[PDB]
Every structure is written in structure tokens, then in C-alpha cells.
Paper text:
Central to its single-stranded nucleic acid (ssNA) interacting function of human [name] is a tandem of four K homology (KH) motifs, namely KH1, KH2, KH3 and KH4, which is embedded in the middle region in between the self-regulatory and transactivation domains at the N- and C- termini, respectively. Comparison of the four structures showed that they all adopted an evolutionarily conserved eukaryotic KH-domain architecture, consisting of a three-stranded β-sheet packed on one side by three helices. A common property in recognition of up to four nucleotides is facilitated by a ‘minimal KH motif’ that constructs an ssNA hydrophobic binding cleft formed on one side by two short consecutive helices (α1 and α2) and the GXXG-motif-containing connecting loop and on the other side by the domain’s β-sheet and the variable loop that links the β2 and β3.
In contrast to the upper part of the binding pocket, considerable variations of the amino acid compositions within α1 and the β2-β3 connecting loop led to the remarkably distinct properties of the nucleotide binding pocket at the lower half, which is responsible for interacting with ssDNA nucleobases. For instance, a longer loop together with the presence of small hydrophobic (A194 and A197) or polar residues (T385 and T388) in α1 of KH2 and 4, respectively, resulted in relatively open binding surface with strong positively-charged electrostatic potentials. Interestingly, the potential interactions of KH2 and 4 with ssDNA 5–8, which shared the presence of a triple-repeated deoxythymidine (TTT), was consistent with the previous suggestion on the preference of [name] for T-enriched sequence. In addition, we observed interestingly also that KH2 preferred the T-rich fragment 7 over the TGTG-core fragment 8, which was in contrast to KH4 that showed no preference for both ssDNA. As expected, in contrast to the wild type, all mutants did not show a shift in migration on native gels upon incubation with the selected ssDNA. These overall results suggested therefore that all four KH motifs of [name] interacted with c-Myc FUSE ssDNA independently and individually, and KH1 and 3 might exert potential preference for ‘TTTGTGTT’ sequence while KH2 and KH4 might have broader binding specificity.
Residue numbers in the entry: 184 to 222, 231 to 256
The structure:
Amino acid sequence: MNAVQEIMIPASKAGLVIGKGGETIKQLQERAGVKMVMIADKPLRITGDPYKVQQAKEMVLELIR
């Protein structure tokens, strides 16, 4: 069954996660093999295979650092 994990994204970083046209969040979904959607700091909801969600969490946190 899918894991669901939320990363809180500061408002100032939201555009960076999504990117122009959504091209950054599309790349992130392809590279990590999960679904990511946004829900003040905004939750990014990551859904997928439990192993892929853990890696995707690290990839997103590293990007927004």
C-alpha cells in the first residue's frame, strides 16, 4: 500500500519546488517515481511506494535547502 508523507514548503520556496510550467515537480516525480502535489508554509504531499517516498522526501528537502 502507498505511503503518504508531507514536506512543509516555505511560501518563498513553493515556486522553486513546482518550477515554471510545473517542470521541476514533474522532474522530481519522474526521478523519485512517486506522485507529489501541494495541499504560510504549504504541505507537499508525496504518495507512492514506501521506499520511493523516503528517497523523494530526501530529494525535496535537499532541493529547498
